[PDB]
From a paper:
ID30A-3 (or MASSIF-3) is a mini-focus (beam size 18 µm × 14 µm) highly intense (2.0 × 1013 photons s−1), fixed-energy (12.81 keV) beamline for macromolecular crystallography (MX) experiments at the European Synchrotron Radiation Facility (ESRF).
In a second experiment, bovine trypsin purchased as lyophilized powder from Sigma (reference: T9201) was crystallized as follows: A solution of 40 mg ml−1 trypsin, 10 mg ml−1 benzamidine (Sigma B-6506) and 3 mM CaCl2 was mixed in a 1:1 ratio with reservoir solution [2 M (NH4)2SO4 in 100 mM Tris-HCl pH 8.5] at room temperature. Crystals appeared after a few days and were cryo-protected using 20% (w/v) glycerol. Diffraction data were then collected at 100 K using two different strategies: the first based on a strategy provided by EDNA/BEST, the second using a manually determined strategy optimized for data collection speed. While the ‘slow’ diffraction data set has been collected to show a standard data collection, the ‘fast’ diffraction data set has been collected to show the potential of the beamline. As can be seen in Table 2, the two data sets are of comparable quality (automatic processing using EDNAproc) with both giving clear structure solutions, requiring only little additional refinement (adding waters, benzamidine and other buffer molecules, adjusting side chains, etc.), using the ESRF automatic molecular replacement pipeline.
Numbering used by the authors: 19 to 241
The structure:
């Protein structure tokens, strides 16, 4: 997260880190046994880390649980990042409490101008690289589909939305991928892509979660 703030330990209780010996992506806990992330985050051998603040120090609220299975969206296109969504099942249910908690799926698609909370352990620099050890947070509005398409001609599908600031300075970044965009207490986006981070006229592009609620619910019900 570029141009964000330190969230505070366990203030984003649905935020998970995906670990394969190291943090590589974020995710969102949507019930005691399932995580939503970005399909471009797929790999084998995932350990889900819940209850994290400092991802390099054991602070006392962690739960580390290996994934039993991953399900990439059946229409994921890695070239276009259309349908950049995957589900990860935990081998055992997490223990839920105020510091480790699921986030609800949306009932409604959020609109342009709605304020959302974007969070992650990704790069905090637009130029060069600095990884934080603690969770970073950013409040950002959803942008109009017209401003989104104008920023990224030929690239924005009906399964994407832009959020952030056309002026630059404030954005998600590398290492935030798969993490949450939460608006009015519901998971509306997944950190997906952007051209660099926090560059002018290159806002963040997010998977549009409201399009996937039927697929998520049906997939969980049978797996
Ligand atoms: Ca920790």
């Amino acid at each position: 997260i570029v141009g964000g703030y330190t969230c505070g330990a366990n203030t984003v209780p649905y935020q998970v880190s995906l670990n394969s010996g190291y943090h590589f992506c974020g995710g969102s806990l949507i019930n005691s046994q399932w995580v939503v992330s970005a399909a471009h985050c797929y790999k084998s051998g995932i350990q889900v880390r819940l209850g994290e603040d400092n991802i390099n120090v054991v602070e006392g609220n962690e739960q580390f649980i290996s994934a039993s299975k991953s399900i990439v969206h059946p229409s994921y296109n890695s070239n276009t990042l259309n349908n950049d969504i995957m589900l990860i099942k935990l081998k055992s249910a997490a223990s839920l409490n105020s510091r480790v908690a699921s986030i609800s799926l949306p009932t409604s698609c959020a609109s342009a101008g709605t304020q959302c909370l974007i969070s992650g352990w990704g790069n905090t620099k637009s130029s060069g690289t600095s990884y934080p050890d603690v969770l970073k947070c950013l409040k950002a509005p959803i942008l109009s589909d017209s401003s989104c398409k104008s920023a990224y001609p030929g690239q924005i599908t009906s399964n994407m939305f832009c959020a952030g600031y056309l002026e630059g300075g404030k954005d998600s970044c590398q290492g935030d991928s798969g993490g949450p965009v939460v608006c009015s207490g519901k998971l509306q986006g997944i950190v997906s892509w952007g051209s660099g981070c926090a560059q002018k006229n290159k806002p963040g592009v997010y998977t549009k979660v409201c399009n996937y609620v039927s697929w998520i619910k049906q997939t969980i019900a049978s797996n």
